[PDB]
Amino acid sequence: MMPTPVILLKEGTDSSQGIPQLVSNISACQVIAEAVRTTLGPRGMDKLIVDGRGKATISNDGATILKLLDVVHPAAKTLVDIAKSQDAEVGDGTTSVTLLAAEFLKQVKPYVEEGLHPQIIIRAFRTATQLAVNKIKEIAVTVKKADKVEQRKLLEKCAMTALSSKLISQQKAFFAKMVVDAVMMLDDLLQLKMIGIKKVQGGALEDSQLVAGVAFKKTFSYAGFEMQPKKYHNPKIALLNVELELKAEKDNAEIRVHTVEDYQAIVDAEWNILYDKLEKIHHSGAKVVLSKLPIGDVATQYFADRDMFCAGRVPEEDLKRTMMACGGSIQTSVNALSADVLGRCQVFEETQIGGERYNFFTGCPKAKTCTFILRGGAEQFMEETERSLHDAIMIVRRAIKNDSVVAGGGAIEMELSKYLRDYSRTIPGKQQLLIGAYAKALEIIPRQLCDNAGFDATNILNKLRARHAQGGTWYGVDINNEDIADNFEAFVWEPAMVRINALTAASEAACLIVSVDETIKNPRSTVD
Amino acid sequence: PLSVFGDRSTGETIRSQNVMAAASIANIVKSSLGPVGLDKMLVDDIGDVTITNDGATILKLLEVEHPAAKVLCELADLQDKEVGDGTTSVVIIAAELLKNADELVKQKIHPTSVISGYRLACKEAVRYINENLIVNTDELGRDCLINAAKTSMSSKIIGINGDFFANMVVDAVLAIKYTDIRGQPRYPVNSVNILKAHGRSQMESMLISGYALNCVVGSQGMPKRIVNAKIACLDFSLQKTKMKLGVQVVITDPEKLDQIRQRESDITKERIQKILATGANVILTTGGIDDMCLKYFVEAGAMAVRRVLKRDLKRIAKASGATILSTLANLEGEETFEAAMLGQAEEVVQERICDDELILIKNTKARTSASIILRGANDFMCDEMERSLHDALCVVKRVLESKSVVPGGGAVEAALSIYLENYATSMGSREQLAIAEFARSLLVIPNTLAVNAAQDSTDLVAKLRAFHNEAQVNPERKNLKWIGLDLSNGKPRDNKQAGVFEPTIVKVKSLKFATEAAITILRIDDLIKLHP
Amino acid sequence: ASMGTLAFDEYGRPFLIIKDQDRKSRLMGLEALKSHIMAAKAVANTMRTSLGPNGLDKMMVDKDGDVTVTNDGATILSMMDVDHQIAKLMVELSKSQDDEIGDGTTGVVVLAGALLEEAEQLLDRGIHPIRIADGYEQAARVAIEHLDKISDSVLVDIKDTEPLIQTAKTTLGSKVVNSCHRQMAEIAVNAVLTVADMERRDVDFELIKVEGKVGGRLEDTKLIKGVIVDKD
Amino acid sequence: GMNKMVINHLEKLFVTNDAATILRELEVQHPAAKMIVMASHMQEQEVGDGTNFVLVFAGALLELAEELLRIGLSVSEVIEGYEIACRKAHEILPNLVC
Amino acid sequence: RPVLVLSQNTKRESGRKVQSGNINAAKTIADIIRTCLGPKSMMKMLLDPMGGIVMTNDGNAILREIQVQHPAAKSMIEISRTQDEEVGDGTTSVIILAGEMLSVAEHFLEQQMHPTVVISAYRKALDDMISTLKKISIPVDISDSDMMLNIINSSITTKAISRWSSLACNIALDAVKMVQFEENGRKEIDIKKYARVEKIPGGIIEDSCVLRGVMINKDVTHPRMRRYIKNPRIVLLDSSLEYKKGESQTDIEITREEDFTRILQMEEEYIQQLCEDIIQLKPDVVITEKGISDLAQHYLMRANITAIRRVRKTDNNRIARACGARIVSRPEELREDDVGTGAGLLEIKKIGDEYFTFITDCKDPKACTILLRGASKEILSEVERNLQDAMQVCRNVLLDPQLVPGGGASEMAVAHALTEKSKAMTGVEQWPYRAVAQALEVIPRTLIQNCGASTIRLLTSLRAKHTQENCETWGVNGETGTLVDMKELGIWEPLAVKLQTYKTAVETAVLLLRIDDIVSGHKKKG
């Protein structure tokens, strides 16, 4: 070029244009896919990422791994974004989206290299994705019998399939039973905040329990708390948002007196206000008192003298779960403590779990909430158990919304690839190569399963292709037997929407990446 | 645990790194392939500029650090040394072979199977080329040489002037033809001296029916044109005689000093007189000549050229019939020179070429020699014309030695890809995949050719493959083997009819060298880089 | 095999994927497993010399120079300044064992180190680590069932504390208080039994106040059925 | 048209083929290009579409103005010819309504 | 650990940017000297890095004194040097033409036309340009001195020497005519070696003249020697006239008393014998490229011989050509033919404060010197450059007697012919053909712009005039800015100069259009 004494853009502006930048973008997407490639399948492995502060995160979740990775490549960020999208909309398949998008891009990289117009590739991807989604909706197996037992079995199988890739896969049936039971007790919105997840260090995975009620950690007891009884057999629970303390009446309040009689009267009036609140709470008939605001030592001793239980500074979400379990109402004022606003549980108890004190509200017959208590040898262990249970819970919620399932293990994608190849063999031909490339890219997931399991991917893929061609829809990778099997009969089930969203997001990401021809990076401002 | 003072890369990391290096080297020169290719412009970080299209020159000038990229660079250098043409094609083919082999390996195909498949595919491709895709030059004639030269000079700075440059190249090559023992006509290229001098246009380049020397006469008093030249070639300096280390002059009688000093020069004077007594007109010597012998030659009206290059002197002596004389000494112990050691030419002149002068030994007898003076507008274009002219001379030499030529413009690669894709089904299970990937990799040449012209590469290559498949399936449409690419219109065309030819040795050697390079790089699965 | 990836594109243009990728390290595949196994083996071999009645002590010095001579594995690993993540996992495992049980915080580390040491030579023979983990889980289930089978019951009555005294003595036998062994076991058993919800319920350690004052002798340690305050 | 990934000084991605957005996220420094960008932004404000048309037309006009200045015309003559042609184009445009 | 493929200092650019940058660099080269063309051109001051000042308007000098970094600019500088060396005139014209062709090629490169099509169109256009130039040429009678003087004048009207046109024309014509030589059937001019230009600051420019001989800056070795000889017989030598050591080691061994004196006496006797051998030819002047001993000077003065020592080899060759002598290295082999008879006067005179030796009355001399007297060193350097231009033009005319109309007439005629030819192409390459055809109008356009008249009106009128039948000789009057017939104004250019300019410009455009990728920063690897 030329110096051009006065230049157009600010100095340091880096621009890349043409085929080389698109090839570099595809390579970056391949690099991103490599970082999560070995996390897929029952034989998948965990990744450990350490941040600057020195904290380590161990996860089998694709979205979590990608988020912990601090990606700065403009094209590579699209894969992380679609992983987040899949996590948000579905909750499972965050590795499959990245693998599928990267495989699409890798398959169309050669055609890009001869200078094929990107619009043709985008149109081919759009057509192939529409056909694949329609085929998935057409061939997805659904049961229109509304059988409660069959629905429970389907939910349990889906949860097991969603869980048989994590570290809790050994107890996958037991955890899936917990997850299904917990989800079935949510009322109509299946809100995630209505399922408590408590992680307590110590104990094996089999020691983890689901509480048909609500449980939370003991919250900074005051003096005289240890004299309160710690077990009740039909308690009435008073859910309050009240500070039971000896304090100023108001921040701007100010008392002006000119007689010692008025001084004593004011002191006794403050004491009488506190005692009136406490007496109202006591005469409400409640035995267990929980408050969001602090409960003072005076109130603690007052409740201890009456054989009552008190617990202040309870977290707001814990109070909401206690509401949904026992069936009371949080009161900011104690002036009207009727039986309507009082919670009720069969048994309240405080026990010790791994060197911590927890309060239990069990026996609730009409509870709309749950509480998972997770046990493990390390905090990252419990964190990843929570992540796996979150994946299972999201899968079960989606299955509740619509019970349309397809066989896993790559069987659905092998069927889709066969169908797409059959479609591509009957078109003019410029789109035929791209649709065939899409169908071939659809084979990445079973091949990755075989590679992770230590299989021979080529032979398994050939057998799967032959079986699908000769007849058979739900034949996928059998990880245990080094062969293929009818995965529908093996109860390897996934919701159809999981694959639908995965294909849609991967295709959108591939089209967006291909549609870019120039990348411009402005010089950094305020580098500091 | 290993405690090796260095960096270690193992597994797919090093394989991908090697493939990336090879791909980068291929991408550097991929834009200079085919007639619609364009030259590059190298700067030597000191102001030196090089404009070239030759792949070997580009890869030699670049400084390369990665071992695999080096491997490709010396691969191009070897291809240039042993053939002279196809230097870019071999690098591109090797890099594409490496890419597809790495793809197969990443698909968990063992590299040994890929190597065996590549070896089988290379052998079968060479066999198919030799059996189906060769054309004999016996029934073509001089037109085959002209077309081969024109095809070689396409994609070069002398492309449009091919109608003239091909004639010049063919005449120059045929002028230096000699037959050795076994009755084999040999064509000693690099015996055609190439002289570069800016000035008139490229069309004014001259083909000398003789030899051209990049040197002038030593003294302005000598004539600058001799009609009936009797060339005397010498390999010793004509200066004042000085005695060796083992000889020392010690004077005791002072009367002998003058005689000693006079004889010191009288020895050389007698040698000059002996040389000139035979009628010699042109005297060429590799050594220097001082003023005294220059005046001796001036008085006799004879040429005298000093510091003549040894190779130039050898060529002049061989052409003119003169014999190099490193010394004047017969088998009788005397010091004599007879007319038998004199070469003959019918004119020796000193022409002026753009403010400079050079000596032309025109029409030497007893053997015909040739030389080319390239006229351009600056030094860069003259150098590029020299490189392209050398490529054309090498191509013509290959065509004249081996009388087999193959269609150009991607026809050979397309036919090979079709045949190998068909044939792979009859060999093994995974080596079948290796042979199929070899066949697919062979298609990069037409792809790059089409891309460089901004043509529809996909559709054009598909049409080429369809034509070749029809040729190989239907046994009466075998004439479609010659259907290559016509980059002017972006359509398939019968290249044999169009006169687009290449020597078969170019394709054979390029295939063999690219396959061996891909095998060598593919063998690596680990790298240890010790700190310096 | 380390530092991540360094390509800078096949066209020469910059190829930046991750922020500060030039100064970030990465371990891939089997070598990461071998490094983790070696670190865990080092931790376990450090711990194993403090196992049993004849086990020796470790003298821990913190960042402020304070010295803590101890035999408790959980305390040693908690006060150990490690940087390797697998060592931190060992520390958390010891803390987990201490929180859940309170004893055996040194046996768990030795057992895990032995398990990983055997897994090393199993991996060297070409077995997927997931299969090793599954086999370990199966064998652990078998061992737990056998432990339940061969277990024996003891009476936890307050009238006969001999089995409780023997269990406390076995627990204390590896500590420095083995000189006052029987008195220590007696006071521990009596302290637990005095404050405990009898119906097999929890034992509230908040009601057991452990106070220590220098001077006197170890034999002067006593159980006081009341409260000791640092006032007058 | 092809989308462009433009990254401003705050590391914010902008993948788009909208000319006004691209110019807004570009750190344009040449003041003549600043006038052109301001004209594009004014077109976006007044109508909402046609910014790329404004850029292309201004660039073509200035290229041909440079050609005319090179061949010998003065700046004032080029300006008056451009204004006359713009008036003629505005007169013609209503007749092209389909 | 920078693994890298290429070295970190290697940088690669490719695509449209490289072509645009190359064409812009060529345009900038053209724009540097655009204003230095035509009779009304202005001069430029160049400051050398060594402290010297080069005040000139010659294109090649200006481009040579400029250092550039963009290698396309280096290519353009090489083009300038090639044009100067080949013909000696038309440097600014070729630079401007190359720039204009590259601009009109960039126009097509902006569209979707491949550079190879443009290059092929350019080559076809160049062939037609050569054909048209050969068609519109006219012969010259070289024996007509008036025509030669007019041609030289037309060459030098655009230079600072134009104030003294007849004098410069006569100097150049006489020098070229009497340096012309023919030997053994070979014809030569050889302006480079002989026909020396010697400039002495001071005096007036009107005193400049070309001597019928040679002049050197030398004085007699001894004052007693004659400084004015009527009809000298000159003898030239290369070898020294002093005792010198031998080639081999020649240590002596003295044991007798008289051997030292004998050695010294024999040294003196050797000098005497050499001087006697020289005197045997009875010469008057002895010239040597090497030193002459004092004893040799005495022995020469004894025979009334003037001696000059330490002369340059080129000067000695020039003297040999001028006075009809040949240089002899060994005095004992001095033949009669070696003695230089033909010089008609030798005179040593002092110019300013320095002695100068004149051999300036030779009959039929084949070498000459041009004595320039001027205001200062820079003025004399510019006058020497103008004289070089004139002498190159004269020798080109002598070699090729064809002329072509100047003042823009030739460019417009060739452009019209090529435009008429392009009307039957009916292809896709007709557009670049016509573009490069009409790009030749930049020469009349530049002439008009430098003159200060209206460019568009004058070019339109000139094109309309050239559309007629017999109007190939109509051009631009560089002074008055009017359309005149060049057979009336009398401005003509040698056909060789125009042909070289057109060929070189077209080939520069072809060479620069062929390039689309630049890699730089690598080591020399020599």
Ligand SMILES: Nc1ncnc2c1ncn2[C@@H]1O[C@H](COP(=O)(O)OP(=O)(O)O)[C@@H](O)[C@H]1O
């Ligand atoms: N028992 C099984 N047998 C074969 N394949 C399975 C099995 N369980 C899960 N998969 C496969 O694992 C893939 C998803 O892997 P996983 O890590 O569980 O979720 P994600 O896709 O979110 O990473 C699915 O495509 C599914 O086909």
Ligand SMILES: Nc1ncnc2c1ncn2[C@@H]1O[C@H](COP(=O)(O)OP(=O)(O)O)[C@@H](O)[C@H]1O
């Ligand atoms: N006129 C033509 N038409 C079509 N293809 C051609 C033509 N001339 C050459 N080619 C092809 O272009 C390819 C590139 O050759 P080139 O790159 O010039 O040789 P090298 O590889 O030695 O540099 C050759 O393989 C040849 O087949």
Ligand SMILES: Nc1ncnc2c1ncn2[C@@H]1O[C@H](COP(=O)(O)OP(=O)(O)O)[C@@H](O)[C@H]1O
């Ligand atoms: N008196 C004149 N009137 C008009 N044009 C002239 C006159 N003299 C010379 N020219 C033109 O000027 C050009 C010479 O320009 P000059 O400054 O010599 O450039 P260069 O040094 O590159 O030859 C010639 O092409 C000639 O046609």
Ligand SMILES: [Mg+2]
């Ligand atoms: Mg999953």
Ligand SMILES: [Mg+2]
């Ligand atoms: Mg070639």
Ligand SMILES: [Mg+2]
């Ligand atoms: Mg113990």
Ligand SMILES: [Mg+2]
């Ligand atoms: Mg719009």
Ligand SMILES: [Mg+2]
């Ligand atoms: Mg001139």
